[PDB]
Design a protein around this ligand. Structure first.
Ligand SMILES: C[C@H]1CN(C2COC2)CCN1c1cc(NC(=O)Cn2cc(-c3cc(Cl)c(O)c(C(N)=O)c3)c3c(=O)n(C)c(C(F)(F)F)nc32)c(Cl)cn1
Ligand SMILES: C[C@H]1CN(C2COC2)CCN1c1cc(NC(=O)Cn2cc(-c3cc(Cl)c(O)c(C(N)=O)c3)c3c(=O)n(C)c(C(F)(F)F)nc32)c(Cl)cn1
Ligand SMILES: [Cl-]
Ligand SMILES: [Cl-]
Lengths: 122, 124
């Protein structure tokens, strides 16, 4: 069929615009003292943890999810921006936190990219 | 010591997973009614892909509606082609459907689809 090569990226951009305007967000993720509003569909599409949560009968209808308090909010922020943008901002000062947060969120390609960053920088 | 990494497959992988959720009726939040067919979807995806749906659901008086009735003169098969396009990036244009898809894309305010329809006509 006719393939629109920019369509998926344009969809994601528009989803990120909805998130910035707080339109149809349906969950708050709490990470220590920081709160992040998001769309469950995007979280589920991007994360094994969120897919498991929002397919679990006991948890799927929650509108507030408290993540492990040991997770670094900056690590989560970097990963949530990645979910909505395809762009992953890695630095020596954040790599360990992003990698551990990606393991927790079950984002395997992000973890592999973090390993590649360690290989390139250690 | 620093790197800004673009994941070139990420957006298409997100969209595939959204289509998987729709196919299982997970987190769908609206039924679009088009003449003799009902279609379930995610409002966020509809808004992301169509000027009409963007305008409808940005309106706070319509944002939380669970059923939207479209103009009854819209061809439901044209709509289904466009809904599948929204969730897949693939558009099935054929001589037997081009006029219906084009007219539906005008109504949904999907300009790059409309333009692709015009290119199809030009090449027919
Ligand atoms: C279950 C699956 C297959 N099933 C088939 C098999 O028989 C039928 C059809 C239904 N499918 C399905 C899956 C959905 N969501 C997920 O898969 C959640 N998800 C997302 C990712 C993910 C996505 C993108 Cl886009 C990325 O860029 C990256 C990255 N850069 O790291 C990571 C991911 C992951 O890395 N991992 C290990 C995992 C983990 F679970 F393995 F841990 N889960 C991840 C959604 Cl929403 C809807 N349907
Ligand atoms: C308004 C915009 C920019 N604004 C910036 C500018 O300063 C601040 C920020 C907020 N923004 C925003 C917009 C959102 N949604 C839409 O734009 C709706 N949408 C989507 C499309 C569209 C999208 C994809 Cl992916 C396609 O593949 C195709 C296609 N192949 O045809 C068509 C589309 C369109 O073609 N047309 C004419 C129109 C129309 F309205 F013009 F008619 N609307 C379309 C969403 Cl959800 C969230 N935020
Ligand atoms: Cl914006
Ligand atoms: Cl599948």
């Amino acid at each position: 069929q006719i393939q629109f090569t920019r369509h998926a990226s344009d969809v994601l951009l528009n989803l990120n615009r909805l998130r910035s305007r707080d339109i149809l967000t349906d969950v708050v993720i709490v990470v220590s003292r920081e709160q992040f509003r998001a769309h469950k569909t995007v979280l589920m599409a991007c994360s094994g943890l969120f897919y498991s949560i929002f397919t679990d009968q006991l948890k799927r209808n929650l509108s507030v999810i408290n993540l492990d308090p040991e997770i670094n909010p900056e690590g989560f922020n970097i990963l949530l921006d990645f979910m909505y943008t395809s762009r992953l901002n890695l630095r020596e000062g954040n790599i360990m936190a992003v990698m551990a947060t990606a393991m927790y969120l079950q984002m395997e390609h992000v973890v592999d990219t973090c390993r590649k960053f360690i290989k390139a920088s250690e």
